[model samples]
Target: MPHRFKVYNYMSPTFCDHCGSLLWGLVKQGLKCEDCGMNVHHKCREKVANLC
Candidate 1:
């Protein structure tokens, strides 16, 4: 399936969906979260890149 950049779950809570850590950054490509906004660590981007 094509990767969907849109938020997977708005109701998923203000936490990192992957690690359940607190989130604090504006939404953007590669921005995982505020506390740990590492583009390389974004679950969605990582998944898509792996598939390619």
Candidate 2:
């Protein structure tokens, strides 16, 4: 699993969910948060989706 980008559970980049940074990456495939319209990295999505 390559970590090419960061995934934010929240909409704003006030904090990063992975590194706790105030920055986030662009959205890619299967990277959309229904709650806040937030986006996440495609790679992160792949890793997460496969976890379950």
Candidate 3:
């Protein structure tokens, strides 16, 4: 066998749960916090954790 690693068991949000942002827009935002279900855009991920 070769080197191996484990995948994180965190969950992803259905949509961008950031404040005042269009969720159904064309741009896809994947950044999310599974522990408390905090979804955020790539831009907001930095601040979301602090806010939460």
Most accurate candidate by lDDT: 3
Q: How well does each candidate superpose onto the true structure, as a TM-score?
A: 0.31, 0.27, 0.43
lDDT of 2 by residue, 1-52 (tens): 2333333344445442333334454432234544444344444444443221
Candidate 1's C-alpha lDDT? 0.39
Candidates' RMSD to native: 8.7, 7.7, 9.7
Candidate 2 steric clashes:
0
CA lDDT, candidate 2, residue 15: 40
Candidate 1 minimal-lDDT segment of 10 residues: 32-41
Ranking by lDDT: 3, 2, 1
Residue-by-residue lDDT tens digits, candidate 1, 1-52 = 3233433223333654445455444543233333333323255455433221
Residues 1-52, candidate 3, lDDT per residue (tens digit)? Answer: 2112221232432555556564444435444454555655566565553533
The global Cα lDDT (0 to 1) of model 3 is 0.45
